[model samples]
Target: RSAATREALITGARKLWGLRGYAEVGTPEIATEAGVTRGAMYHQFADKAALFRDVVEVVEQDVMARMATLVAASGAATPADAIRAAVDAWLEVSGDPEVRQLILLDAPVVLGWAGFRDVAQRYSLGMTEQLITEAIRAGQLARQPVRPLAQVLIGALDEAAMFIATADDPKRARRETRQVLRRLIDGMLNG
Candidate 1:
């Protein structure tokens, strides 16, 4: 019963945070959403921040997993194809209101800079590094230091994702963002 209640709290918190953001929701709101009480939430999590940290982890893992699935299903035949596929997948999902608000915006603020970066490194950075390494090995990218290039590429994509997420016209933003990212990626491949 205790474990089930704890799981309900976490699940409800994840949904609430994704929908309304961390700053907008409160313990009472989360507990009510979970069909529990404030005490239940407090018993399971230290506080809202701790609960948010766990939620961020769950959401981040989902994002990473989604990207992986998209890349694998992209029918990418080369390293460059795989890279483009991954970025496309990211952009496709990054436009989700929940993803945009929660992971891109609220998580960073809630988790703090170091904590957010650490989570990003574990998923986005690590995935980008692997793709970049593959591109180099397949001669799809220039023979340079892998880490620096991966960092820059990931940074660009990260900024682009945020831009799309925050845009007033997200559809146009996504189309334009994809065009620019593809051009930039092409340049990298050819340079």
Candidate 2:
């Protein structure tokens, strides 16, 4: 039952918002794509907003959580290593069609700015804070405001991903973005 319902929800989501942006699809189209009655779609999700929340959660687990795991595994061996892992994870996941379309593009319209910010704080902001704390504990980071630094790091990566998502050449975007991130981290670690 859960599988069927989940499949219906996600199939609808992918059809509406995967390769194209959210603006390209609507609830009726989603229902048709899922091959479920509109009533069944509503039963699984109250509305488009609710469905988008579920999509965010899925993308968060698959992408954001994976990045957190990568940083956690680093154990703050070096600020460089930790930062590299974080940046690489961000690059790898943020570019994913599902993640980019759901979290980056459709998020504001579907979930509103407040809702998106709340989820980001819970997942992305929380992960950055944990990583910075570890770096500080390991004497890899200077004594400073941890939250601000984390916000900067996460914000930079997010902006980079937004730019890369639209670029004609994602490969070059990823390569150049990583280089910039590495330089940014190097400066912070040394300062």
Candidate 3:
């Protein structure tokens, strides 16, 4: 019963938070939507904020898995190609309203900068570091410091995703972002 109630709350919270955001949705409303009482919600999660933390984790894990699959399925011939493909896929996926709202926009503010960075390090930062290592091993990129370069690249990609997510013309923003990213990658590889 406890397990079931927790799952229901997580599901309902994910839906509500993605659609209406954190401020608009309350624990009572989430409990009602989940078909669980407020007591059940409180028993499962300490508070609405705690439940939201779980929701963010769930969403981040899902996003990481999807990105891994997208990168693997890309058939990219090189590490640089794979990195670019991953960035493109991220921009495309981040354009979804739910993704933009939950992950890009709200996660940072709700989770706080350090908390958000911890989550990002687990997923995007780790992946970018691995890709940079691959590129360095392949002699495709310069022998500069790996972690710093990876951090810079990840920062750039995050900014690009945010820009695309909030743009009036997302498609155009994505196109331009990709172009700029490609040039940046090219500079890294060639310089």
Which pairs, if any, clash in model 1?
none
> Which stretches of model 1 miss by more than 4 angstroms?
1-3
What's the CA RMSD of model 3 in angstroms?
1.6
The number of the candidate with the highest TM-score is 3
Number of backbone-clashing residue pairs for each candidate, in the order shown: 0, 0, 0
lDDT by residue for model 2 (34-128), tens = 77888888788877777777777776767776777766775756755776688877887787787778777788667776777677777778767
Cα RMSD to the true fold for all candidates: 1.7, 3.0, 1.6
> Higher-TM-score candidate among 1 and 2?
1
Q: Write the per-residue lDDT of candidate 1 for residues 65-177, one digit (tens) a residue.
A: 99999999999989899998999999988877788888889977887778876887777778898898899898889889887887778778878998887889988998999
Shift of residue 187 alpha carbon in model 2, Å: 0.8
**Cα deviation of 72, candidate 2, in Å:** 6.6
Please provide, for model 3 over 1-191, each residue's C-alpha lDDT reduced to its tens digit, 9 standing for 90 to 100: 79899889989989988998888898999999999888778888998778988888888888888889999999999987887788877876787777888888888889888888788777777788898889888888888888888777877888898888788998898899889988888887742
lDDT of each: 0.85, 0.76, 0.84
> Model 1: how far is 96 from its true place, Å?
1.8
In model 1, what is the error at residue 36, expressed in angstroms? Answer: 2.7
lDDT of 1 at 161: 90
* Model 1: worst 10 consecutive residues (lDDT sum): 116-125
Query: Which structure among the candidates has the greatest lDDT?
Result: 1
